Amino acid sequence: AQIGPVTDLHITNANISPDGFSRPAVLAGGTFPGPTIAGNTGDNFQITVFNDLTDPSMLTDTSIHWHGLFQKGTNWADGPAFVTQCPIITGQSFDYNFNVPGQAGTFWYHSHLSTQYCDGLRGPFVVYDPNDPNASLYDVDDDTTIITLADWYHTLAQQEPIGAAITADATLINGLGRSFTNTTASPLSVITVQSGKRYRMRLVSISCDPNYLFSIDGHDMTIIEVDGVNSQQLTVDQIQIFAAQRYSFVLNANQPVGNYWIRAQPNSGGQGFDGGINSAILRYEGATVEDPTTTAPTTFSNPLVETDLHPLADLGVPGQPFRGGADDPLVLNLAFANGRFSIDGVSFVPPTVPVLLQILSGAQNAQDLLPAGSVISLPSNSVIEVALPAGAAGGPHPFHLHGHNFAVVQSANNATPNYVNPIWRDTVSIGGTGDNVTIRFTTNNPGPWFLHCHIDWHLEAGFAIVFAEDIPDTASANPVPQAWSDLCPAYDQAHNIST
């Protein structure tokens, strides 16, 4: 069952074996992935998060981010530790109480403390639209049509060297999959469809690192949503999905009744499908209960290319149709050396006082804010352009901005910008050497918004900056509840920190 929009959510430790290997984890709702949190557009969500964690090897503190939800007027509820809150300590709870005006689509939630979400705290978050403009394109859209793609590690996250190339041990599709080494024939996930029906498959990358080449043997996929943004219909036979991205696609159950492989090939870790790694099963009602015998093609003839996507609505692009054609045009210098990432020469290390609390205490320019050199102020009611030229080791890096979606004016592997009708999204691959992926948005949401690579190991190694958007209006725009004001005293007391 789905839970929400008003619900408790318990965060616990437990042993799980999603690939046949047992390890302890950090779980929401007792499962991996966590339960789907759902509601309708414009609803009030009140997710009362109970931190019941006791195993220090995966951290006993926590904080949860609602990925892709703008949090306008509720920056305090966004979740990134030491940006918008101090962590929730064990034995305490915290009500994330916010609204989702003007958004409908496929989202997710995850820990936003250190690398904790890799240890299991990740789940889907769906905001349905009772008047969805895409409703007539499918018959079925429910918890059974959500498809999660996850990397899974046998080593606990707090034992992964910082700045290292860290590699997974299994791909999990809907929480199940087989290990790349010492492979055992553990259960594969089954997605069941009825011949002749059309399904809104909600594809969610809950990855900590790899991107996946996703396909379904014998089927194609008609994209209708990208990171919460409705798209024109685009039919593809493969989707390369980077960490934290989402797509909705229509699956037409129009092939013979039978069993078909669902494939998710990561860019690192196990290659291919030997022993049923990187796999799940599409089963038609009435098919024999047996593994598929289908083949992938050698090459995919209609892969997704990001510049082929266009919004369903006339969203346009803010600003002027040339590089630098914005009120506040930025170019970030994105680098890696010696185990640490940097942005504009500064490696991110979380501050002791959350950025939002520094601003509410009266710090009002970005040079007064800690960490020094990690906070960039943005002016209010202005067009922002951010160029993100690639080249730093460990790519391709999927960059994500909190508080906002953005027009993708220039995509990976294509030097041509689009100032007319690019897709809007919230997490974008910045590509390869010599690329100049560029985003634009307008500043109508006061508060400190994280910008970072969504490969969680990279964030931990410093690949982040904070956009302090409209510092002067942050306090009036974001009134804070007493329970939020209580978090930093409680946290600092528990950890013997003075501030």
Ligand X SMILES: *[C@@H]1O[C@H](CO)[C@@H](O[C@@H]2O[C@H](CO)[C@@H](O[C@@H]3O[C@H](CO)[C@@H](O)[C@H](O)[C@@H]3O)[C@H](O)[C@H]2NC(C)=O)[C@H](O)[C@H]1NC(C)=O
The residues annotated with a catalytic role in the active site are 65, 67, 110, 112, 397, 400, 402, 452-455, 458, 463
In the sheet with 438-442, reading across from the earlier edge strand, the strands are 328-331, 383-387, 438-442, 406-410, 424-425
Handedness of CA 74, 80, 84, 89 (dihedral sign): positive
41 contacts 7 by C-beta, under 8 angstroms:
no
Interatomic CA distance for residues 369 and 375, integer angstroms: 7
Interface pick for ligand X out of 299, 416, 496, 498 (rule CB under 6 A)? 416
Interface pick for Cu ion out of 87, 386, 458, 465 (rule CB under 5 A)? 458
453 binds, among Cu ion, Na ion, ligand X, none (CB under 5 to 8 A by kind): Cu ion
Q: How far is the CB of 192 from ligand X (least distance, A)?
A: 35
Tokens of 107: 């989202």
Q: Please indicate if the annotation marks 154 as binding a ligand.
A: no
Handedness of CA 81, 429, 66, 171 (dihedral sign): negative
414 binds, among Na ion, Cu ion, ligand X, none (CB under 5 to 8 A by kind): ligand X
The 3-state secondary structure of 361-378 reads: CCCCCHHHCCCCCCEEEE
Mind giving me the DSSP string for 377-396? EE-TT-EEEEE----SSS-S
Q: Please indicate if the annotation marks 219 as binding a ligand.
A: no
Nearest position to ligand X, beta carbon: 324
Q: How far is the CB of 383 from ligand X (least distance, A)?
A: 13
Nearest position to Na ion, beta carbon: 316
Q: Note whether 307 binds ligand X by CB under 6 A.
A: yes
Q: How far is the CB of 286 from ligand X (least distance, A)?
A: 40
Specify the residue, 260 or 441, whose C-beta has the smaller distance to Na ion: 441
Specify the residue, 316 or 489, whose C-beta has the smaller distance to Na ion: 316
Q: Write each residue from 381 to 420 as x if it is in contact with Cu ion (CB under 5 A), else as -, in one continuous string.
A: ----------------x----x------------------
Handedness of CA 404, 409, 410, 411 (dihedral sign): positive
The residue assigned the tokens 């803010």 is: 318
Q: Note whether 125 binds Cu ion by CB under 5 A.
A: no
Task: Supply φ then ψ for residue 482, to 5 degrees.
Answer: -50, -40
Tokens of 11: 């965060």
Q: How many residues bind Na ion (CB under 5 A)?
A: 2
> If we measure between CA atoms, which residue out of 233, 230, 231, 227 comes closest to residue 246?
227
Q: Write each residue from 311 to 350 as x if it is in contact with Na ion (CB under 5 A), else as -, in one continuous string.
A: -----xx---------------------------------
Q: Note whether 23 binds ligand X by CB under 6 A.
A: no
Interface pick for ligand X out of 389, 442, 480, 490 (rule CB under 6 A)? 389
Amino acid at 351: P
Which range touches ligand X (CB under 6 A), out of 81-89, 178-186, 217-225, 323-331? 323-331
389 binds, among Na ion, Cu ion, ligand X, none (CB under 5 to 8 A by kind): ligand X
Interface pick for ligand X out of 418, 429, 443, 445 (rule CB under 6 A)? 418
What is the C-alpha radius of gyration for the chain, rounded to an integer number of angstroms? 22
Interface pick for ligand X out of 16, 296, 331, 494 (rule CB under 6 A)? 331
Q: Write each residue from 238 to 277 as x if it is in contact with Cu ion (CB under 5 A), else as -, in one continuous string.
A: ------x---------------------------------
Q: Are strands 398-401 and 427-429 parallel, antiparallel or unpaired?
A: antiparallel
240 contacts 306 by C-beta, under 8 angstroms:
no
Task: Supply φ then ψ for residue 460, to 5 degrees.
Answer: -60, -35
> If we measure between CA atoms, which residue out of 427, 432, 390, 367 comes closest to residue 359?
367
Tokens of 359: 């601003």
Binding residues for Cu(2+), as ranges, are: 65, 67, 110, 112, 397, 400, 402, 452-454, 458
Catalog residues that contact Cu ion under the rule CB under 5 A.
67, 80, 244, 397, 402, 450, 453, 455, 458
Catalog residues that contact ligand X under the rule CB under 6 A.
305, 307, 323-324, 329, 331, 387, 389, 414, 416, 418, 436, 438
